[PDB]
Amino acid sequence: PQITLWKRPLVTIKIGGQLKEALIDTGADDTVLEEMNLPGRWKPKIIIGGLIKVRQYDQIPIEICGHKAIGTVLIGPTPANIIGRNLLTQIGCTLNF
Amino acid sequence: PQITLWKRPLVTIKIGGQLKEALIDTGADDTVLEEMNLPGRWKPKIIIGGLIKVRQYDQIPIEICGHKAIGTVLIGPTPANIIGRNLLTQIGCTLNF
């Protein structure tokens, strides 16, 4: 689709079978969602206040406005759901003007 | 233009006659640049570590890859130059996929 920036670009993402509202954030390298139940092994990662510990899951299937992609998702006490570039490149998201 | 997100979307902005590198950040409501000399009156604002004081200048002319726009610019000890939505809407920047 084509999203304008008059308001925060919040979209729906399907991950782990659940639907959620995340913010398309071109200024974020990574994707970090609030606590949820994901299947698989994960590894520790330390990354909105100070440092927080999160769980890094790799090659997780996700869906943003249709568009099926896979990639790394950090799950943790993030103040907000953020879709970063690591996933934005996977759905072919670009900035245009 | 059309910018892909394989790397951080850094662009050049002309403000106060000087050129600078800022990051197009759809996840940021406002625009905040590192200390520079801008003409005009400004007002105090408190907003990457904890809180920092900055100077809010309104209706400042700016230029991002051609495209002349005007808007509010926060100037201060920001860890990085950020072009927020407040200006992205003014140059007709959209997200597309």
Curated annotation (Swiss-Prot), chains A, B:
Q: Which domain of life is it from?
A: Viruses
Q: Peptidase A2 domain location, by residue? A: 20-87
Active site annotation, chain numbering: 25 (for protease activity)
Instruction: Identify the stretch(es) annotated as Dimerization of protease.
Output: 1-5, 48-53, 86-97
Question: How the protein assembles, per its UniProt entry?
Answer: Homodimer, whose active site consists of two apposed aspartic acid residues.
Under which name does UniProt file this protein?
A: Protease
